[PDB]
Design a protein around this ligand. Structure first.
Ligand code: N86
Length: 307
């Protein structure tokens, strides 16, 4: 019916890694992973559940683990393994600069057009790969992209991710706390999710980046979004955006899903713009901007296990 998912899920001993410090409150730690019987140290982020008495929460972390184990792309976050102690631990690649949402808010005065457009390309490559894998993210947002380096971002948070119905080329959900301000009209109205609903949220994510992390429809209640969208209203042109960039964002927000660009087309359009960034974004001072033993440290991206 479909191709078998031969991804490996790696179980790690808790003695294989050291928590160095806390990054956020379950709880995320900065840490180091020594693959058992390998002379390598891998910077990791270790996500540990708090209560561990919640069967619900345990199902949710393993779903995430299932999806992150099944993706292998330079622009999607990858899981190194899980640890089944009292509290289940997810070990992933450390992404030391944090979320791109925070990163553009914190660095709004240092970020030039070449970085914004290259990020739009990389997120499009990430999302096109996911589409190839028949995977619908359903929660794409500048908060859900992480910064390995200012040159290199990755889509994260597969908590909401689901497969597309090949026989049913759409997903059908039922309740929760949801990101109304990022969602396609068909999603808010009919809980319909596709790759094309992922393109709508890709549009909003590009608007967050191009406004240096402004809040979409700030001050408008979630209850009002569906009406506003139905009245043909959309997020306004960011000051730095040429009409070229903004028109692409607007195409991602068309009511007809099949009228939106494909991720493969967004790769192409942002790359053309990436070859001449000052033609496509106008930024003040753009021209003048730049962004134990570590002996056996290697990045996760240079740590490959056989396929
Ligand atoms: C690409 C693996 C991954 O998802 N890494 C991840 C997750 C959370 C987080 C928080 C703070 C710093 N780095 C990371 C990295």
């Amino acid at each position: 019916g479909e191709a078998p998912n031969q991804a490996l899920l790696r179980i790690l001993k808790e003695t294989e890694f050291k928590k160095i410090k806390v990054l956020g409150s379950g709880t995320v730690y900065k840490g180091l992973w020594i693959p058992e019987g390998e002379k390598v140290k891998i910077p990791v982020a270790i996500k540990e559940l708090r209560e561990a008495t919640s069967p619900k929460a345990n199902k949710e972390i393993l779903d995430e683990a299932y999806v992150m184990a099944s993706v292998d792309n330079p622009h999607v976050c990858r899981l190194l393994g899980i640890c089944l102690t009292s509290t289940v631990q997810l070990i992933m690649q450390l992404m030391p600069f944090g979320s791109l949402l925070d990163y553009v808010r914190e660095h709004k005065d240092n970020i030039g057009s070449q970085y914004l457009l290259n990020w739009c390309v990389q997120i499009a490559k990430g999302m096109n790969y996911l589409e190839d894998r028949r995977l619908v993210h359903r929660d794409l947002a500048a908060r859900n992209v992480l910064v390995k380096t200012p040159q290199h971002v990755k889509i994260t948070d597969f908590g909401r991710a689901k497969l597309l119905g090949a026989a049913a080329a759409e997903y059908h959900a039922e309740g929760g706390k949801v990101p109304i301000k990022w969602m396609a009209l068909e999603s808010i109205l009919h809980r319909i999710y596709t790759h094309q609903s992922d393109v709508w949220s890709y549009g909003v994510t590009v608007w967050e980046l191009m406004t240096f992390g402004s809040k979409p429809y700030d001050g408008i209640p979630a209850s009002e979004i569906s009406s506003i969208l139905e009245k043909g209203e959309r997020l306004p042109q960011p000051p730095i955006c040429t009409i070229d960039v903004y028109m692409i964002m607007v195409k991602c927000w068309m009511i007809d899903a099949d009228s939106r660009p494909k991720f493969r087309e967004l790769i192409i359009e942002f790359s053309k713009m990436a070859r001449d960034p000052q033609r496509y974004l106008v930024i003040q001072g753009d021209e003048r901007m730049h962004l134990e033993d570590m002996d056996d440290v290697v990045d996760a991206d240079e740590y490959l296990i056989p396929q």
